[PDB]
Design a protein around this nucleic acid. Structure first.
Lengths: 52, 718
RNA sequence: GGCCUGCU
RNA sequence: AGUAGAAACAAGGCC
């Protein structure tokens, strides 16, 4: 399912989400759903912030 | 009359005048060469105390290994490494029963510690063997090289910053198909296959031990690699947590607490005994302690301690004995030859001992090589069936405490009983009984049980005498501990850090010895005078009044002449000495504050001065121009590792800039996993934002700093 | 002869 | 020769 998270989002969002997951210690290979959730939350917050 | 100092013991009891028999005033013996003659002997002896064990062949490192555990019970008093697993587990189980909940609480505390510890903790260590250069490098340098290689070769989980993540990286490395390193000789890429890297990760580097007191024959001391460091750290943390909860374990505490514990034990045993019961204190000592603590017993203990704990914790704790059971002991520098007729000498690396002919060596080194050759593999010898030196002292002390506990009269099921205090490699056992044959039976039982657990009492350094007089790791006890002053004698000289540090350290040492080792007032004063004399003679900082001629005397005299209140100069600048028995706890510069001239006072403690090193035994110090730091040997320049100095320069520049950005980096280590540039840029942007919002920064400066940060980010992204 | 090192 | 004691120094590396 890594293709979905890697494609449906921007490269920067997935990169910083990877950094966050590495920070907390998790492995994206196992907890893929957590990776997708983190990317989605980051995209939500960025769309909230931008254009203001 | 033939003066005879030893005849003084006809009147003074041996304990009181025991300081006389400590020749701690002359240079300690120093190893004069290669530690490869003692390492082979250690390997051979370790394989000779376990020869009856079960041989095998490791299928990963491809080297022979010995497995003495559950071997045949010893039949002679000679040292035996045939520890019995059932007996070890019985000792541990009885220890847990006598102290309910010790292991559970220890495991909880260690789980917190392991979940919390950071990779930076591996830097606080002594010399370690870094597997990327096959040399001994400081802990920080070895860790940096290891992390660099891991990042280069695809291992990057340690970037999280936790130590356990680095351990995961270490374990994942051993499965890597082929590691590669980029060591210099312009640099080359050397690729290590799986087996070569695995043998290099398990290898131990052995160097001869220097400055050893109380032995005629030199020993060998080993330093572990960088992969095994973290697991050993976690295991040692668990063992220390367990020992701190044991009343009979003296290892994890200082000298005075050892005195307290031992006195408490003696009072409990001797006093509580009725009139009819006898008592006997054994001031024994174990022989070949390291060559018999088989790591498999440590694995059994670690598995019994961690019962009913999360599997991850159990694995991370068990990994250390598993790696130590397969250790390879790197031989050492290798012998050296000579040619009397041809008038020349040659050095042979220890690696080619497996291939070199035996026509060169002595009649003893030839036998040692002939016997160690079967174990050699790629220049290292298998050393499975024993330890090299400590590295598990806490756990070994736990074992000793268990065997001491095993005689509480609840497990003895007999009139005689024993207890005492255990400090790794040293014990004091206090037997009780209703008759002498009872004491004999108790001693036999203790000796046999220790032999079963795989630890041997030394019968040539142990005596049993009625309770009272006894000794324990050089803390003599005669109805109350007597202070022997000859052990702390080496500490009195100038330590050698720098001027202010040396003054503080010397006065603090004198005070402490007055407190603990019962140093009298007059002796303390004479020690103070001698220390000042030595300090002046070493730092050329004579009193100024004197006509001494030295490289530094001219302007010491000039400063003395210039000053008004000459009784305020620091002893480092030629001032008078103002200490006494009542001022030893006050740092010098704080002592002469009232007597100082304003000009000299201002010049002395000036932050702008370029000598203070911004700080670095607890000696009370005051920042001052006399806190400079000494140079380094600069011996690397000739070698091929010249490039490391440029790396140091660049690292220092970057870290100084970071210090500039983040004030707290110096005080508390900086945490976080964002690259340094990104952190610096984010801090700059937020600082400018807040300043512009309410502060000095205006629109022009805000725009300039923001565009500079934008171009910095652009340069980064390239 | 010159350079470099005095725990590498 | 000398220091020293289970192995070394009595100078070493490079151009």
């Amino acid at each position: 399912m890594e293709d979905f998270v890697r494609q449906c989002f921007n490269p920067m969002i997935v990169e910083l989400a990877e950094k966050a997951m590495k920070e907390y210690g998790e492995d994206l290979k196992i907890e893929t759903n957590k990776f997708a959730a983190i990317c989605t939350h980051l995209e939500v917050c960025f769309m909230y912030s931008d254009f203001h | 009359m033939d003066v005879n100092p030893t005849l003084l013991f006809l009147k003074v009891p041996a304990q009181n005048a025991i300081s006389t028999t400590f020749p701690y005033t002359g240079d300690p013996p120093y190893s004069h060469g290669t530690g490869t003659g003692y390492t082979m002997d250690t390997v051979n002896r370790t394989h000779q105390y376990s020869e009856k064990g079960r041989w095998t062949t490791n299928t990963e490192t491809g080297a022979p290994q010995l497995n003495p555990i559950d071997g045949p019970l010893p039949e002679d008093n000679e040292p035996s490494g045939y520890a019995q697993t059932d007996c070890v587990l019985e000792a541990m189980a009885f220890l847990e029963e006598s102290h309910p909940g010790i292991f559970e609480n220890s495991c909880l505390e260690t789980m917190e510690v392991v979940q919390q510890t950071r990779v930076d903790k591996l830097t606080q260590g002594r010399q370690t063997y870094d597997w990327t250069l096959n040399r001994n490098q400081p802990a920080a340098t070895a860790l940096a090289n290891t992390i660099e290689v891991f990042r280069s070769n695809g291992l990057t989980a340690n970037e999280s910053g936790r130590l356990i993540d680095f351990l995961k990286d270490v374990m994942e490395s051993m499965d890597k198909e082929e590691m590669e390193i980029t060591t210099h000789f312009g640099k080359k890429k050397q690729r290590l296959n799986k087996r070569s890297y695995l043998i290099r990760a398990l290898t131990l580097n052995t160097m001869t031990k220097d400055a050893e007191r109380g032995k005629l024959k030199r020993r060998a001391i080993a330093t572990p690699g960088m992969q095994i460091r973290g697991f050993v750290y976690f295991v040692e943390t668990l063992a220390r947590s367990i020992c701190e909860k044991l009343e009979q374990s003296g290892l994890p505490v200082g000298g005075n607490e050892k005195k307290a514990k031992l006195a408490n034990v003696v009072r409990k045993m001797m006093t509580n005994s009725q009139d009819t019961e006898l008592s006997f204190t054994i001031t024994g000592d174990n022989t070949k302690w390291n060559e018999n603590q088989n790591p498999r017993m440590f694995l059994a203990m670690i598995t019994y301690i961690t019962r009913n704990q999360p599997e991850w914790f159990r694995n991370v704790l068990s990994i250390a004995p598993i790696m130590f059971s397969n250790k390879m002991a790197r031989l050492g520098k290798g012998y050296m030859f000579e040619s009397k007729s041809m008038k020349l000498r040659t050095q042979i690396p220890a690696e080619m001992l497996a291939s070199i002919d035996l026509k060169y060596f002595n009649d003893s080194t030839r036998k040692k090589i002939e016997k160690i050759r079967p174990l050699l593999i790629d220049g290292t010898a298998s050393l499975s069936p024993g330890m090299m030196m400590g590295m598990f002292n806490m756990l070994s002390t736990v074992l000793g405490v268990s065997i001491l506990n095993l005689g509480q009269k609840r497990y003895t099921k007999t009139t005689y009983w024993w207890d005492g205090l255990q400090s790794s490699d040293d014990f004091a056992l206090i037997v009780n009984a209703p008759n002498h044959e009872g004491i004999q039976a108790g001693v036999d039982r203790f000796y046999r049980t220790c032999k079963l657990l795989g630890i041997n009492m030394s019968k040539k350094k142990s005596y049993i005498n009625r309770t009272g007089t006894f000794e324990f790791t050089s803390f003599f006890y005669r109805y109350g501990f007597v202070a022997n002053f000859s052990m702390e004698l080496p500490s009195f000289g100038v330590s050698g850090i720098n001027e202010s540090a040396d003054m503080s350290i010397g006065v603090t040492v004198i005070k402490n010895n007055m407190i603990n080792n019962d140093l009298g007032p007059a002796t303390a004063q004479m020690a103070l005078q001698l220390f000042i004399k030595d300090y002046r003679y070493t730092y050329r900082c004579h009193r100024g009044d004197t006509q001494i001629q030295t490289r530094r005397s001219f302007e010491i005299k000039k400063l003395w002449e210039q000053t008004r209140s000459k009784a305020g100069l620091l002893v480092s600048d030629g001032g008078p000495n103002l200490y006494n028995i009542r001022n030893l706890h006050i740092p010098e510069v704080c002592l002469k504050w009232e007597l100082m001239d304003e000009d000299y006072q201002g010049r002395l403690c000036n932050p702008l001065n370029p000598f203070v090193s911004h700080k670095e035994m607890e000696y009370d110090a005051v920042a001052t121009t006399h806190s400079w730091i000494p140079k380094r040997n600069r011996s690397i320049l000739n070698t091929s590792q010249r490039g490391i100095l440029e790396d140091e320069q660049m690292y220092q520049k970057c870290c100084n800039l970071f210090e500039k950005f983040f004030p707290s980096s110096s005080y508390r280590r900086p945490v976080g996993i964002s690259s340094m540039v990104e952190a610096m840029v984010s801090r700059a942007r937020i600082d400018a934002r807040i300043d512009f919002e309410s502060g000095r920064i205006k629109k022009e400066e805000f725009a300039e700093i923001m565009k500079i940060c934008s171009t910095i980010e652009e340069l980064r992204r390239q």
